[PDB]
Amino acid sequence: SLRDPAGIFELVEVVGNGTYGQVYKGRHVKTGQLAAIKVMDVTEDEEEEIKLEINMLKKYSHHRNIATYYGAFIKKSPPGHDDQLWLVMEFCGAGSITDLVKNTKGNTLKEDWIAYISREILRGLAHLHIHHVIHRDIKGQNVLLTENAEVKLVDFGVSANTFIGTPYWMAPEVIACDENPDATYDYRSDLWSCGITAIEMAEGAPPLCDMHPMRALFLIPRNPPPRLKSKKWSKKFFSFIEGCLVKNYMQRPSTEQLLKHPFIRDQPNERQVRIQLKDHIDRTRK
Amino acid sequence: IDLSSLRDPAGIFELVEVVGQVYKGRHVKTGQLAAIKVMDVTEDEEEEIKLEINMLKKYSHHRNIATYYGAFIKKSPPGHDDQLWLVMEFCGAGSITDLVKNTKGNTLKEDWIAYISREILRGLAHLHIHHVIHRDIKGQNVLLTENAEVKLVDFGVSAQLDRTVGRRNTFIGTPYWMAPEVIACDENPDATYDYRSDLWSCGITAIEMAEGAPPLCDMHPMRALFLIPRNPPPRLKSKKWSKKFFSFIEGCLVKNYMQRPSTEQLLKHPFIRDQPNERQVRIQLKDHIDRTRK
Ligand SMILES: Nc1ncc(C(=O)NC2CN(C(=O)C3CC3)C2)c2ccc(-c3cccc(F)c3)nc12
Numbered sequence: 001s002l003r004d005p006a007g008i009f010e011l012v013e014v015v016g017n018g019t020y021g022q023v024y025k026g027r028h029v030k031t032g033q034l035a036a037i038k039v040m041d042v043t044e045d046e047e048e049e050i051k052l053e054i055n056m057l058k059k060y061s062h063h064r065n066i067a068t069y070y071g072a073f074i075k076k077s078p079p080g081h082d083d084q085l086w087l088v089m090e091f092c093g094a095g096s097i098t099d100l101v102k103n104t105k106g107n108t109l110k111e112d113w114i115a116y117i118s119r120e121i122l123r124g125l126a127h128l129h130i131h132h133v134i135h136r137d138i139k140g141q142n143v144l145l146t147e148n149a150e151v152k153l154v155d156f157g158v159s160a161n162t163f164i165g166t167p168y169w170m171a172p173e174v175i176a177c178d179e180n181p182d183a184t185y186d187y188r189s190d191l192w193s194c195g196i197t198a199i200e201m202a203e204g205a206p207p208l209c210d211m212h213p214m215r216a217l218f219l220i221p222r223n224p225p226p227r228l229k230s231k232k233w234s235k236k237f238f239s240f241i242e243g244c245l246v247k248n249y250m251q252r253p254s255t256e257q258l259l260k261h262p263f264i265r266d267q268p269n270e271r272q273v274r275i276q277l278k279d280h281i282d283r284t285r286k
Numbered sequence: 287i288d289l290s291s292l293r294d295p296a297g298i299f300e301l302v303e304v305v306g307q308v309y310k311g312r313h314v315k316t317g318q319l320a321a322i323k324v325m326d327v328t329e330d331e332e333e334e335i336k337l338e339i340n341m342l343k344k345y346s347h348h349r350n351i352a353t354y355y356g357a358f359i360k361k362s363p364p365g366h367d368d369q370l371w372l373v374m375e376f377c378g379a380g381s382i383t384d385l386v387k388n389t390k391g392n393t394l395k396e397d398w399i400a401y402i403s404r405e406i407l408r409g410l411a412h413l414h415i416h417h418v419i420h421r422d423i424k425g426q427n428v429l430l431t432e433n434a435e436v437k438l439v440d441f442g443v444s445a446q447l448d449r450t451v452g453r454r455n456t457f458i459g460t461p462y463w464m465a466p467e468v469i470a471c472d473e474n475p476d477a478t479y480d481y482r483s484d485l486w487s488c489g490i491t492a493i494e495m496a497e498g499a500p501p502l503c504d505m506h507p508m509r510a511l512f513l514i515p516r517n518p519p520p521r522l523k524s525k526k527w528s529k530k531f532f533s534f535i536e537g538c539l540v541k542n543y544m545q546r547p548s549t550e551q552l553l554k555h556p557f558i559r560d561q562p563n564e565r566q567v568r569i570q571l572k573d574h575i576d577r578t579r580k
């Protein structure tokens with residue numbers, strides 16, 4: 001029981017060409033300031049799958065590494081169709097880190113850039129985990145950048161609806177099997193996803209990308225922990241990947257333990273990397 | 287009109303209004319209504335389409351298939367993702383999901399289920415004899431026309447262009463209509479796609495027409511995907527249904543695809559073959575379309 005978005009917000013275009021679904025690049029009518037709008041048709045069979053998606057965005061978006069919730073609206077539809085719920089949040093102008101690697105020579109980021117982004121993801125995850133919230137969808141597409149290289153987490157669509165989605169970033173425990181019938185979920189599942197995102201930043205695609213999603217979903221709980229293809233990477237980076245990709249979630253380190261990892265903790269070029277990333281955004285824009 | 291080419295849609299087809307989204311189109315020359323699926327494809331994805339166009343199997347028009355007219359690409363500037371247009375026949379009454387939802391108790395009459403299922407099977411029979419698996423049989427992909435004609439969705443099902451390219455290609459979609467064999471397990475490491483997979487999907491669509499939703503709807507898609515290859519064949523909740531209907535469901539939902547009947551064998555099933563109210567049901571469905579429209 002909110003208000004109509006008319007004169008307050010307006011849709012411009014669909015952002016991720018399908019990746020995020022019905023997510024638009026919106027505009028605050030009065031100021032002209034950009035915002036991202038998630039549009040979801042409120043049906044009788046989706047009444048509480050939308051109500052608590054608003055409650056999660058408002059409460060947990062108050063953190064520098066999470067895209068801030070602005071407000072929720074309802075655009076009333078004529079008698080013969082369902083109403084549209086508009087979920088407004090801060091817009092991230094630089095795009096996703098999947099798009100960043102895709103628009104880089106050799107489809108690979110500098111090891112210190114991976115260290116900066118991964119730390120910011122972990123910092124965002126730490127805020128959610130302390131608040132008893134699992135993201136459940138950490139992937140390069142759900143990790144966004146702003147015009148001044150700020151890293152922000154997005155999508156609470158599956159956080160703790162009938163489609164399974166991309167499997168490549170899923171942790172083994174997330175995928176139900178014979179010895180894991182109920183797929184015992186944990187906050188540490190996001191850390192496996194964070195490690196796959198680091199391989200994604202280092203190679204331009206997640207492990208098993210060249211496979212059918214159904215075969216990848218079958219192999220993730222059977223295959224040994226994924227490794228980086230190239231030997232060029234530092235011993236600190238291999239240790240971080242190893243740390244994130246522990247097959248059994250029961251002996252996988254916590255977000256706090258991973259924040260203390262030398263690859264995340266020891267960042268001497270922090271300022272220089274932030275400028276290097278800011279330069280890369282401008283160069284791609286023009 | 288060509289299916290083996292990748293022409294610009296200019297002068298051939300034009301978009302009219304909103305209905306990978308499907309938009310109401312038109313044939314520039316005749317004015318004939320069309321359903322156009324518009325997808326933003328990268329330069330590399332355009333080459334995948336050129337390959338898959340060669341993978342297309344040729345087959346005639348059919349009374350129970352919304353005719354696929356071809357694929358086109360509307361060129362965007364060098365750097366921007368071009369638009370892939372997949373043109374198909376227009377069905378004014380909408381999907382079966384829309385029909386069962388806009389019906390009291392979210393259930394169709396057993397004879398209506400018998401008529402629709404037979405028309406799905408007839409459409410599937412034409413594709414199967416032409417070595418083509420539909421791969422996405424469900425209520426939402428089974429359409430009705432103003433004249434209460436049942437037609438299957440076809441945006442090049444032979445090459446699966448509407449599912450190979452785009453952002454949602456790497457996504458595992460809705461699992462509820464999937465046959466056990468299309469889901470990978472320990473003694474099925476590689477998902478085997480047989481023509482009979484559509485028949486399991488057809489049987490799940492019959493449960494969808496009878497109950498409003500497919501079996502295991504009340505579950506997380508990941509748990510449903512896990513249970514489909516383990517759970518015994520799904521059954522109808524209500525005992526009200528005829529012995530012919532239970533037998534048809536049983537016939538469609540044979541766990542092992544190797545032991546599942548063919549489309550021809552299922553067309554000879556008493557629930558499909560014996561239809562005395564065929565004309566009356568056709569009128570009943572035509573009446574239902576008109577009263578929903580007003
Ligand atoms: N908050 C967001 N800001 C920017 C973009 C995005 O895609 N931005 C790129 C497209 N870009 C532009 O249009 C440039 C010109 C400014 C950058 C963006 C994309 C997806 C989502 C998202 C997904 C699922 C759920 C959800 F609640 C939010 N949220 C956002």
Ligand SMILES: [Mg+2]
Pocket residue numbers: 061062063064065066067068
């Ligand atoms: Mg914030």
